[PDB]
């Protein structure tokens, strides 16, 4: 038993070692490893699979094998090599689809990730990617999911050309149609990792050799210049197609109005600056058409609308579009947020914890160059204090800190204030102008530190 397992492991090690020393001459050993893998023992199956993974990654070329002794035998060698690689992959989907056995499946996922990270450029990558994404498309996080998404994320970062990323994006999009755009939120975060979008003495030479060396050097320089231009154009075209597939998936997700609207707006905000100007004007229409977790969704729409308008140079590109409809939506949405409860527990625009966007929308609102503090901020801040009647003090202190560090010198925000227009539903007090409410009641509250927070506000 144990002796037999040890003997098989030694045989695999010897065969693997011989392959590393002389890979071309020992192709039959790979078939022997497959026979060894056929052994009933689960542990021997794991070791044989790992050795096959180690053997394949060591002998696989760094280039893509062009399909069909110096050239003929190499072709037969490469054609022969592709056959085990296909057979090894064929076993991979068999064991993956077949899902003690859990450990073997985790190992099967592991070698799949290793092939993804290293053998992405190689042939059969379409099958390799399809098998891996099929595991992620499931409703529950299957084991090794963290490994696969990390491998996919790493490829998206390293892939400067974007051809491999385009293949994965297409496969991911196909799963979304199969899943009706209902997948884990981590899956949509893969599109955010696309680097293409985020980019925004001497040995002696004979008299004949010197002329050959000069002639090759001229070709290489000409090759490099043309390749650079072709690379720039191909990357640009790949970026366009990736945006086409990604945005069509996001818009489909918005149409279904599922629970993945959070990740869709995340991607839309991140990739909005990559899209055409004409689409920027029509982008806010879809955001503002969803007004009939409803409060949470409206928060995403107004925040993303702010982010899209926050793009640099919008002053030069006067697309207008009157984001005031989103402004009044945020102006009205604070009251239901104060009405419903919220819990941070303990240990989507850009983050989580809904209160975080609100201050984030407020701080980008403040960061707007002179767009506020024209007697409109005070009207907004009044209901901000009204909405501050509940929620943790650190949140309450945060919003009061925003007006504390505010450059505007208005001081009547927490007291009687100018006309509260724009949907009203509050004390207008028109034409008052008196430097003379909420902090008085805020002093009496469950946490003792709110009292001193109110005191520090009135003293400051």
């Amino acid at each position: 038993v144990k002796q037999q397992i040890k003997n098989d492991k030694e045989a695999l090690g010897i065969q693997a070692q011989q392959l590393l020393e002389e890979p071309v001459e020992n192709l039959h050993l790979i078939r022997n490893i497959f026979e060894k893998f056929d052994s009933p023992y689960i542990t021997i199956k794991k070791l044989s699979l790992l050795t096959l993974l180690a053997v394949f990654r060591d002998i696989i070329p760094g280039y893509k094998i062009r399909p069909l002794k110096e050239v003929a035998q190499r072709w037969e060698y490469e054609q022969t090599l592709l056959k085990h690689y296909a057979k090894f992959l064929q076993t991979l989907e068999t064991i993956l689809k077949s899902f003690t056995q859990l450990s073997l499946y985790q190992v099967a996922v592991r070698c799949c990730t290793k092939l993804i990270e290293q053998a992405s450029h190689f042939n059969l990558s379409e099958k390799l990617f399809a098998l891996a994404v099929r595991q992620i498309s499931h409703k529950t996080k299957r084991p090794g999911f963290d490994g696969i998404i990390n491998s996919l994320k790493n490829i998206f970062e390293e892939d400067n050309l974007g051809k491999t990323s385009l293949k994965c994006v297409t496969i991911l999009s196909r799963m979304f149609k199969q899943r009706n755009y209902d997948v884990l939120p981590d899956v949509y975060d893969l599109f955010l990792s696309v680097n293409i979008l985020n980019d925004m003495d001497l040995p002696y030479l004979t008299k004949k050799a010197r002329k050959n060396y000069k002639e090759t050097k001229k070709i290489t320089q000409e090759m490099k210049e043309a390749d650079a231009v072709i690379t720039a154009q191909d990357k640009e075209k790949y970026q366009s197609e990736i945006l086409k597939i990604i945005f069509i998936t996001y818009f489909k997700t918005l149409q279904l109005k599922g629970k993945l609207i959070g990740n869709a707006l995340e991607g839309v905000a991140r990739l909005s600056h990559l899209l055409n100007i004409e689409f920027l004007g029509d982008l806010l229409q879809v955001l503002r058409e969803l007004v009939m977790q409803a409060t949470r969704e409206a928060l995403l729409t107004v925040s993303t609308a702010f982010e899209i308008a926050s793009a640099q140079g919008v002053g030069k590109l006067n697309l207008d579009l009157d984001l005031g409809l989103f402004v009044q939506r945020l102006y009205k949405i604070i009251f239901p947020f104060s009405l419903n409860p919220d819990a941070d527990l303990n240990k989507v625009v850009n983050a989580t914890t809904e209160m975080e966007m609100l201050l984030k929308c407020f701080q980008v609102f403040f960061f707007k160059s002179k767009n506020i503090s024209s007697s409109r901020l005070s009207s907004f801040s009044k209901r901000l204090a009204i909405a501050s009647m509940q929620l943790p003090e650190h949140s309450a202190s945060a919003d009061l800190a925003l007006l504390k560090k505010l450059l505007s010198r208005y001081s009547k925000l927490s007291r009687l204030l100018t006309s509260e227009e724009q949907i009203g539903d509050g004390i207008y007090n028109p034409f008052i102008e008196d430097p003379d409410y909420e902090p008085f009641l805020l002093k009496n509250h469950y946490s003792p530190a709110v009292s001193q927070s109110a005191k520090e506000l009135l003293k400051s």
Partner: protein, 245 residues
Amino acid sequence: FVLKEVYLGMARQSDKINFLKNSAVNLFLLDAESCYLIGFRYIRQLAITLRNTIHSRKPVQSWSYVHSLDFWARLLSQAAWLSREKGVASELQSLVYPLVQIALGVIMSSPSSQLFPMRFHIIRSLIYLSRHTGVFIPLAPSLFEVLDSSYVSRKKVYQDGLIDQLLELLSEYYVLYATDISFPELVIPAIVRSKRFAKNRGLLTLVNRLEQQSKFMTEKRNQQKFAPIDSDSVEQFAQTIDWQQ
């Protein structure tokens, strides 16, 4: 040690239970600082049970636990009264906030209509503790959620009783916060939510009463045009306005 033994006996028992609770409260009042550790330990035990429930909820929602929570709230209210009398917030009085947070967490963890009476009892205890301590309570969001709940918002005898209890709790909270200068401002979000939900007779009466209270508070605030430095005038107006009904 004697206070701890009395508290343990009262908890085990939970007329006789009321007498045991009164004896424990009297022993607690004898040495509030010494009994503050006992009250904190009881609050910590309740928090531990709630934490175990979150990580179940039956131990938190048990009748014995409900009695224990009520006893802790009563002890916190008595400590708050002693704290106000002495001019300094006692440790047991300050422990009311953890109890309120525990009660809110239990209510959130058990939002069922069957468990609604437990939530109403917890809300009433929190309102009484808030009134005794003089500290405002954020029970309006919970009351609005209870009123807007499908059991209360949509019609039946149990639903009517729950709606009446919620209306009574809301009226008590409004009366307690009536003295506040910003009483119309703090009740504006609740009034808008109540009007939206309405858009039956009891809800309409409560909305009309809240609107009248907001109008009276706004008139008092307009009359009290003094600057924030003259907080005595606001306090005097706060004392004058009672709205006990």
